[PDB]
Amino acid sequence: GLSDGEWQQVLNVWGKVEADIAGHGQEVLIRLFTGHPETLEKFDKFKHLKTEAEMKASEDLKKHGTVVLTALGGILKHKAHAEAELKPLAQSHATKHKIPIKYLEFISDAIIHVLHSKHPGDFGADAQGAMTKALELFRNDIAAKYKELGFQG
Amino acid sequence: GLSDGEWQQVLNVWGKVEADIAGHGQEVLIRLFTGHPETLEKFDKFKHLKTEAEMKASEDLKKHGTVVLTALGGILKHKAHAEAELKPLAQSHATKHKIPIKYLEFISDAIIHVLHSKHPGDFGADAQGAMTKALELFRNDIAAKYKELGFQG
Numbered sequence: 001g002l003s004d005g006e007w008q009q010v011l012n013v014w015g016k017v018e019a020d021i022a023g024h025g026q027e028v029l030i031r032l033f034t035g036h037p038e039t040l041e042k043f044d045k046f047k048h049l050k051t052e053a054e055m056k057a058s059e060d061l062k063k064h065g066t067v068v069l070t071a072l073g074g075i076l077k078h079k080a081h082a083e084a085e086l087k088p089l090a091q092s093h094a095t096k097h098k099i100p101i102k103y104l105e106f107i108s109d110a111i112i113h114v115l116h117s118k119h120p121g122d123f124g125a126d127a128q129g130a131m132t133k134a135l136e137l138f139r140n141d142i143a144a145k146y147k148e149l150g151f152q153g
Numbered sequence: 154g155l156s157d158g159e160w161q162q163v164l165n166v167w168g169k170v171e172a173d174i175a176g177h178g179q180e181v182l183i184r185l186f187t188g189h190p191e192t193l194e195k196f197d198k199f200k201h202l203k204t205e206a207e208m209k210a211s212e213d214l215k216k217h218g219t220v221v222l223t224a225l226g227g228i229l230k231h232k233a234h235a236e237a238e239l240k241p242l243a244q245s246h247a248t249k250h251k252i253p254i255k256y257l258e259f260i261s262d263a264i265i266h267v268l269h270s271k272h273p274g275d276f277g278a279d280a281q282g283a284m285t286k287a288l289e290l291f292r293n294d295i296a297a298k299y300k301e302l303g304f305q306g
């Protein structure tokens with residue numbers, strides 16, 4: 001994964017992109033299409049463009065550039081925030097508390113038991129299946145950080 | 154992973170949890186401790202507590218239950234939001250646009266060059282090292298979604 005400061009580096013340069021997301025988007029796609037022409041053939045609405053000049057002139061190529069960098073920006077900002085929130089918890093449970101993944105499984109089953117007992121109206125079979133998958137994904141994230149830190153959990 | 158409706162089911166039952174986080178946190182730790190006595194040994198503050206009635210009387214156990222469900226809740230809500238943002242992107246690039254992972258490596262290459270070219274003051278060796286790793290994490294997330302969908306590309 002990235003460190004705390006590694007994400008801050010990423011978000012700082014991303015702010016600069018957002019000051020002219022249109023121009024950045026355009027240049028990224030044109031650099032892609034010139035360096036790797038086979039990428040242009042995946043785009044039914046752009047593959048007619050032959051020259052740099054035609055590409056720079058395309059209103060919709062510039063609009064698509066914005067759509068791509070906006071979506072990627074949103075994803076990176078969520079990853080940064082999510083990592084900063086998870087890594088402290090993973091570190092303390094790995095190093096200080098030394099909690100095996102097995103014990104995270106037990107507390108996952110305890111949550112599902114309590115939600116079945118107290119909220120069956122918003123916890124039918126489907127919603128229970130959903131929570132079981134959700135808590136497994138959470139354990140998997142922790143297990144991934146445990147490995148990064150070389151704690152056998 | 155979870156479908157759109159499954160994440161909504163998770164968020165919907167979590168809303169009920171957060172409405173009585175005190176009581177739910179207590180019931181989760183009592184269920185864990187009574188089902189798996191070994192887990193009580195990890196808790197210096199609680200390991201003397203011998204019965205549900207003792208555990209229910211512990212103000213410390215209640216406060217810890219709140220800290221646990223508060224931390225978990227934040228992680229689940231972020232995961233639901235990020236997945237609902239990522240899953241459609243991966244779905245469309247796999248099944249509609251048919252974009253191999255190697256082409257996301259190409260566009261990552263172009264994003265690095267455009268950032269180095271236009272914002273070098275904000276894009277030194279470390280900043281560029283950070284962005285390179287961050288774009289890898291993005292491609293790995295799409296790659297993990299493609300594998301789920303049995304798209305090789």
Ligand code: HEM
Pocket residue numbers: 039040042043044045067068069071072241242245246250252256257260
């Ligand atoms: C950082 C990488 C990428 C991001 C964030 C991104 C994002 C997007 C978004 C948000 C859309 C519109 C919604 C959708 O159809 O899912 C889209 C459409 C599309 N993307 Fe991507 N994309 C990326 C990489 C690529 C690459 C490398 C290719 C092809 C070589 C590609 C080909 C397409 C195509 C063909 C469309 C459909 C465009 C249309 O509506 O005519 N994408 N992309």
Ligand code: HEM
Pocket residue numbers: 088089092093097099103104107108192193195196198217220221222224225
């Ligand atoms: C959903 C699972 C879990 C969550 C979200 C969680 C969260 C937390 C948080 C936020 C803290 C306080 C800050 C910290 O030290 O990181 C904490 C402390 C702790 N956790 Fe966990 N925890 C989980 C599972 C477990 C399990 C299963 C055990 C043991 C079986 C455990 C043992 C501890 C201990 C011993 C502490 C320190 C308690 C204290 O000194 O007051 N945790 N946990």
Ligand code: NI
Pocket residue numbers: 074078234238
């Ligand atoms: Ni978002």
Ligand code: NI
Pocket residue numbers: 081085227231
């Ligand atoms: Ni948060």
Ligand SMILES: [O]
Pocket residue numbers: 068
């Ligand atoms: O794209």
Ligand SMILES: [O]
Pocket residue numbers: 221
């Ligand atoms: O915990």
